[model samples]
Target: PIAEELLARVLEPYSCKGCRYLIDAQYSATEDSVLAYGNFTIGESAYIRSTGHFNAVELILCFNQLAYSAFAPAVLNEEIRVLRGWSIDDYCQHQLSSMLIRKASSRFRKPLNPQKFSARLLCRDLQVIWRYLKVPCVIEFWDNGGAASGEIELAALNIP
Candidate 1:
């Protein structure tokens, strides 16, 4: 298990005290790819008191945390190809401000409860152009009752 405290530090610049929803994550990475799974529970949203049902906001938040968890370990070790040269410090300082969700769309196959859910993220395709690291990823969510999924294109500029 990857330490949640380390994840908290890696996500420090992008997360607030109350907004950290990804309580646990475990991942494996190779030079060109990353695979990760995470646990999330929305006790109380920082934006709203209660949504009662799963919505886009909660999905995005969970996606962001899982994606970061997927990237952080590989990025910190400078092991991933597209992000090969970046140092952990530089990533922590610049990742959020420079990252762009170029495209994001979610599919709710069935009703998904937002209270407690599990997520899995897979990232394989990446392109480096326009001075940015552009990755197209697939993320899925599930609980006891149903399933949901998303496809996202994430771009990060200002590489060092």
Candidate 2:
């Protein structure tokens, strides 16, 4: 049910992006509750917390070089607006994005070009949801010109 509800809410905002996509939602016939794929698959999720209130959701965006170069500027501009609303300063976004790029390169055993890679902070509160939902999500940029994987994690934000 959550996935269905989320799908209805999300598509309106992102339907213009041209890409082949998939939406998989399933419910166990024997179970009383519904289950949905978190950010790991759908790139975003929404849920009622233990506190029993609807909360905002965060989506981690991963992009390849072609996607990144074409979209990063627009994405960054939108992300900055979100971050500003959250009271996170520009300096923080710069630092966090920088740290994320460095960390991914080292951990993934590949070279990352900071110049080629661009990141924006969408939300900071989603990290709480990431832990609560227990899902692994990442935003990466892929480089078509190089063997290196141009992937980057944009943000780990809390939902509420």
Candidate 3:
């Protein structure tokens, strides 16, 4: 896994010529389009479908790396809780607790309380990222899903 600071540094100046958008820090070139909002974009199809479900094993491995790096142990545990279908509020609580743990661990070497994390705090962080970045995102719940392949549109954003 790449260091978060190094990843941020490398991507800081990089912008998509196609969309004129700055990519997120956690995104790689291959995964860059995954978080995009439009249907015709490179990552749209993958995002629309359950790419995570399809790539569960790969994601698990990658997540382990992420957990080992920037995430505190509580954060990792919360992530697992989210994956297990816990309520978003509960997940956010754990997420905030994890953040606190990370902070406290750095300063005092003490564990943080998972119950102290707040959904409001998680939403605030998400809002900040979305507002600052001007990106589109979606969250959906589906009872059943399937996938199919189709030609992807690659038109330049500035092109008529």
Candidate 4:
């Protein structure tokens, strides 16, 4: 099995990133909640979205230790809600990991061109890293609902 702490640690920062964004940009609190979001951005086939995605949102992102420098393609902002007891960091880790193992973010993961670091492959790379690091997440994709991937679910329904 993968080391639980590995992910918990590497993901702590991004989870914090998502956490702040969710609260400041778009968030809805309740009786109990410490929500998180997943702004997972993968490489593009031809760098069509990379520069644009970041510039469009106005944020600094570092991929594989490569910090953001230019702009044009922009970030894809595939942000999503984090599970209970999760933070933006965890959310990011999950998004990263899920993108590799899961297929829900296919459109987002597909390569726009034949670039060396394609978005889809980047996602895969993260997954690989996550596996090596070992961490669990929200899976990002939920067939029943949708939103900014912010705020967790806290409904009150009782019928049996």
Report, for every candidate in turn, its global Cα lDDT versus the true structure.
0.81, 0.26, 0.22, 0.23
Name the top TM-score candidate.
Answer: 1
Instruction: Quote the positional error of residue 126 for candidate 2 in Å.
Output: 7.1
Q: Supply the global lDDT for candidate 4.
A: 0.23
**What TM-score does structure 4 among the candidates reach?**
0.18
Off by over 4 Å in 2: 1-5, 18-20, 26-160
TM-score, ranked from best to worst: 1, 2, 4, 3
> What clash count goes with each model?
0, 18, 0, 23
Q: Model 4, range 1-160, lDDT digits (tens) per residue?
A: 1122433444455555442121111122222221222233333313243452322122213221111100001111222112233443443444433422121121122222211121101111111121232112121211112211111111111100
Cα displacement (angstroms), candidate 3, residue 34, comes to 26
1 or 2, greater by TM-score: 1
TM-score for candidate 2, please give it.
0.23
* C-alpha lDDT of residue 105 in model 3: 8
Per-residue CA lDDT of candidate 2, range 12-113, in tens? 223354321223222121111111222112222223223321111211232211222221222223342322332223323433223232123212223333
| Candidate 2 weakest ten by summed lDDT | 27-36
Tens digits of per-residue lDDT, candidate 3, 1-160, equal 2344433332232222221111211311111122111111122122244342323222222222222222222222333221333333333344322322111100111221111210000010121120121112221111123222111111111100
Candidate 3 Cα outliers beyond 4 Å, as residue runs: 1-3, 7-53, 71-160
